[PDB]
Each structure stands twice: as C-alpha cells, then as structure tokens.
C-alpha cells in the first residue's frame, strides 16, 4: 500500500486522524488584517523618547 | 531670561492643546513669566509659567 501521507506529504505536513487533518504545512502565507481602535494609540510624551 | 532654546518634542494639529514645547532656560532668578505667542500660529494653554 506504499507509505502513508505521514511520510509522503509535501511541505512536511503532519497527517492526523479524528478529524482527518494536516498540520504545520509550510506552504503559503496568511494575510492578517488588524483593526485597532484609536483609544489604544497613546501619546508620544508618555512613552520614552 | 537668557540661553533659552525651544524644541517641539510632540505636536498634533488637533482642536485641543495637541502640542508640547520644551524650552531650555538659564534665567537670572526664579519668578513668573508671562509666556505668550504674539503671532496667531499657536494658542497657549498657560498664560504664565
């Protein structure tokens, strides 16, 4: 039956069951979008200069 | 007053007092100064320092 996807999957994916999933596949990039409210931006004088 | 230099360590042109100016001074003696800007460029929160 040949080696399973634990040993043949590209990008070094780890193959797990229940649920059937792949983990730590080093392919692609995740685009992150942050929305920070204006309250979190403090003044320059408060932080060290 | 003598040997005074003004530095704008922070400025945002907001409606309120969104700017801080630090002046290095070597005065003859302690006292009270009527700090003022004759021009209309800036409005001072403090009329005396």
């Amino acid at each position: 039956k040949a080696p399973s996807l634990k040993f043949t999957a590209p990008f070094g994916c780890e193959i797990y069951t229940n649920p059937i999933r792949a983990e730590n596949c080093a392919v692609g990039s995740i685009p992150l979008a942050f929305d920070i409210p204006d309250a979190l931006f403090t003044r320059v004088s408060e932080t060290p200069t | 007053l003598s040997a005074a230099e003004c530095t704008l360590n922070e400025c945002v042109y907001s409606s309120d007092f969104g700017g801080i100016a630090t002046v290095k001074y070597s005065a003859s003696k302690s006292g009270k100064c009527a700090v003022h800007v004759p021009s209309g460029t800036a409005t001072l929160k403090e009329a005396a320092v």
Side-chain angles (χ1 to χ4, degrees), chain A residues 43-46 49, chain B residues 9-10 17-18 20:
Chain A
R43 284 217 292 187
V44 170
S45 77
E46 292 183 354
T49 294
Chain B
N9 50 9
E10 161 197 353
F17 303 119
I20 284 182

Side-chain angles (χ1 to χ4, degrees), chain B residues 5-45:
Chain B
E5 183 180 3
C6 192
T7 50
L8 284 200
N9 50 9
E10 161 197 353
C11 187
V12 298
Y13 50 102
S14 46
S15 296
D16 71 305
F17 303 119
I20 284 182
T22 300
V23 290
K24 310 296 189 291
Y25 63 90
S26 296
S28 67
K29 56 188 177 293
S30 292
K32 184 64 66 68
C33 280
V35 56
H36 171 82
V37 177
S39 178
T41 315
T43 286
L44 261 53
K45 177 176 174 64

